[PDB]
């Protein structure tokens, strides 16, 4: 499309061009308001619900200045978050880390969005004011003129909610005139009338205003909690006074008062100050109540996810934790539960009712006089506020608060997903217990014990060099059939010879199921035979999670790439590639079809906004890819690594593909970073954003290329700082040739430890480059060890990781006390009954837990191969075994000794009463 | 001309 | 030159003193058509050649495209420009822009009848020796096969083969009883919570249900066997 | 629009319902047979309140079933092309606005919506504001419309609306 | 061919009698009161819809807006759409219903519109 060409030609980061609202330069006034506004909403305002501090990497008021700087770099200099986080960290650290910078970037969108609506909405107010001014200058009790405070209310708005309040307010008082205003300006009229327009047609304005406090005055009495404005008192009874407004729509005084009270109730319910003051009070006092429907009482059993909260009474919203509210909305959409959010405590007690919020605020509008004249008005006033609170405000505030509590729970799930992805991408290449990379033999197999085990040998460069099929490696050495043993001996010898012929450094085995443990023991023994014979050095044997490898094998890419290889053997290669470099491997399952979402990050990841989750996951790729750096020559030479170019800061998928395409057309390796400018004609802003993150391995170059090779290209030193990097290297040697000086330091990096960078930072500041302490420390550390991999060194999975990896269970899905279905495998001598779960855990039922009555012979109750319901009592993660019981007293848990912990606010009375 | 001091220990 | 004015379509007059008059097609021919258009509330027939007629359709009726990118697909037109006639496909609520002259008008529903007789509606197939599935919608180059896991994958016409019915198979349900094939059951628990249907095929852990009232997934759905109750 | 006609239908009865209270038993099986169903001729039928009369029953030869033509009292809902009716907005998308007229869901493409209305896919509530941010049409809003076409899908209508015609908008 | 613009309906549906939103609201509410096999979710989605659009809820207000309009020379199609839409001006009623163009004068038609707006609860 033309847009792809425009993105390629435009000298701006691709993600800046793909942003919903285009990034526009900002004046210092806008940046200062934005910096304070973002700080208030994103960092200073605590979550309504209890949310875990997700900064796996309360920030003070000093953060406001740091945000102003960060916004300056993004909006005026067009630098992406990674560039700022790595090469402008002196200006944003320690208050803002890379995740905080993304948070600021995402909130900049919201600020720009709020300002855009707030500006056009102001234009509407200016047009409306001009139209009313024309009508008045060219008056009935119902003509309210739009004044300077009406404009100021809008200009002071701090959130989309307050903006919506001002908009709802504008529609209530002026919505009826909008079509008249537009036709007068030169369009056909939106026509429906809320009951408020009927009351206006009846002229009730003269009566509604006589209740006393104006909507705004009541708003201040609410805000200040006292009668700051005294209620004007009319000298007549309301029921007698209503006779003056009797018409065809309101034929009786009793009907006139209901109509007029409705008009007053709506004015109060839509006045911005009243909504603002109530919303604040509502978020602080709101209580959540939950009751199960006819369906919920039958379907929400002990195993259902809604078990801990199907009955809630008076739970403060401030006590909901993590994703719990999302689970509540899901159970409600499933029609299992009914949720109710009230500012009042629910109960039938007299004091309970006397203590309600309505009993508190009615006092701010009642006039304290005992005359019948005033008392009957107070009765009307009571019903005027009551209708405003019960019919308009409590329903709307409950919906708005419901959306915020739900949004916080959805955001938690997104943060939990990114936190899991981060923990996967942070793993470094396996290093044997190195310069030519590691030859890896990946071994994949299907869960069916009759399928052949497949091995794939991948060299350190990522090329598949060979493959092997083993029809009997799945058999067990202690089989009752001698034939199995004999046939397996040929495959054992085949693998031993394959290792002998190819000499791989590490063998990875698929975390498919518990049989992977047998495979590792056999592979370790084969390797141990080579070790005892001293025929080959010890070869690592690693259990590697195969979830990513399954997604690979099922991808369109894994078939097209290796058309002749079976699909099971295709998971053997991804397991070999995954241990070589997890980041390059995870980038393979990030296709245009969004295959990434098939990875099980969180049990609720399918219930969050898809676009928000995708952005939150790509941020984890962008964070790690830029920290690690992408070798362009590796990408051109090996199509496998081309997936990382799209995550390089500034490039993206359109420019990333284009970069490889031009180098492909020229058929030349990328020899130096300057070539991005001279051959790809890359503009200064895109070059600035990506140049520090693109690696060029100077050791791979030679011959005529020697004519121009900047050794610094082989490090994260940014080209803008090459002049300083050379000067810093020349001074460490105290030379009175920049390349010769640098080479001596790169080979002998210890000399840089004596160089005092603090003295040099003062000189750069004096020359006008500003504070450079952290940039110089990065350059010095980088020259001390070029491209030092900041990823966490690879480690073998622990007992907890192995158990979860092979059973595909988590502590939340497989907990002590849980009910389960299991198959009987045998009887232990009787000490108990041996069983096997679907997830492969081997369960054991002690004879004392077989039945409520003492059973001496288990054969009297259970048979081998029989399926039996049981309850987990103890879990042994190390042995893959669980102590199960099947006594009816335990199965039904008559003592409630095993059932999951109920919420603190669980309504035990409602649960007992519904029976 | 300017030179960074190696005064660091 | 060629002309595609099929019986039952609608054509208008592009030039002459009787311009802008949309009528229904009764007589069909080649170059010298001298068509007899049936306008609303008009028993008399006009006369127009092929060089004086245009394939036009008023906004809000079903259209069937013969040639184009999305050829062989049906839907509802919402805006008809000079050449881009956008419509809503009946399969998915998404845009679809095609040429009006290669279009035709039929008020019938897109049935998608079987050709040759190698497959039929609700027939068991064998994609891989490790997985099983049923055919639910016949396309022009591909087929919408629904596997045992419960998702619909898009395969070619020759990439799948007909599997023989396991009419002598049994499984377990929510009440832990012996449930066979060709029985009317109810799906109360599971992904398709609150559904009525008839089982046609069974497997190791899944059941292939079939309905007529449902429109989604060609009226067929798959759930686990332990998510069923006898109806 | 909602209409008023009393229709007739034929239902089958098994021998377990014979005996003296047969005609009384025939009435019950119709109440959950002609409710919430639909046709391309009478439209979507809401429900049956009472039953007028039971015709003569023909026993099927060989088996025990007998059919009974019954006349009943039901109210029906059929939207027609050219009608202007009210609806509630369910979803707003870049392709168009999707609404709901009682028992039926409908769609109006952005093509059929006036040129003033631009998109708001970026904000939390999906809306179509104007250049003036004046008339905002979002989810959960009582919006009038004009039906330009109907469609039947296995006993369910799915019509198509329009909104360029005048006096068709915000509540 | 079935087009409400020129008021053409199937022959078996042409003889039908139109119903007001408040009228079906009363008939549907009465059926719910009698039957709560229980009522279907299809029925509930007609209840909340005609509720939101039941402009007046007392039964006498239903029979009155119908009897006062049929006294004019409007069709029974207009008898329900002019009780559901509640247009403000006669030009709007003529824009919504094309059958009103040239059939009556604006001020008399406006009187019929005011008769309906005044009954709303």
Numbering used by the authors:
A (entry chain M): 283 to 339, 350 to 430, 436 to 483, 515 to 761, 775 to 1077, 1084 to 1176, 1225 to 1310
B (entry chain O): 2022 to 2030
C (entry chain Z): 416 to 646
D (entry chain G): 1 to 171
E (entry chain D): 14 to 49, 55 to 139
Show passages lifted from the paper.
The deposition of H3K36me3 occurs co-transcriptionally when the methyltransferase SETD2 associates with RNA polymerase II. The deposition of H3K36me3 is carried out by the conserved histone methyltransferase SETD251. Here we present three cryo-EM structures of SETD2 bound to RNA polymerase II elongation complexes at different states of nucleosome passage. Together with functional probing, our results suggest a 3-step mechanism of transcription-coupled H3K36me3 deposition.
The obtained data yielded a reconstruction that revealed Pol II at a resolution of 2.63 Å. In this conformation, the SBR of SETD2 is directed towards Pol II and SPT6. SETD2 is tethered to SPT6 such that the AID does not prevent binding of the catalytic SET domain to the proximal H3 tail of nucleosome. When tethered to SPT6, the AID of SETD2 is unable to inhibit binding of the catalytic SET domain to a nucleosome that reassembles in the wake of Pol II transcription.
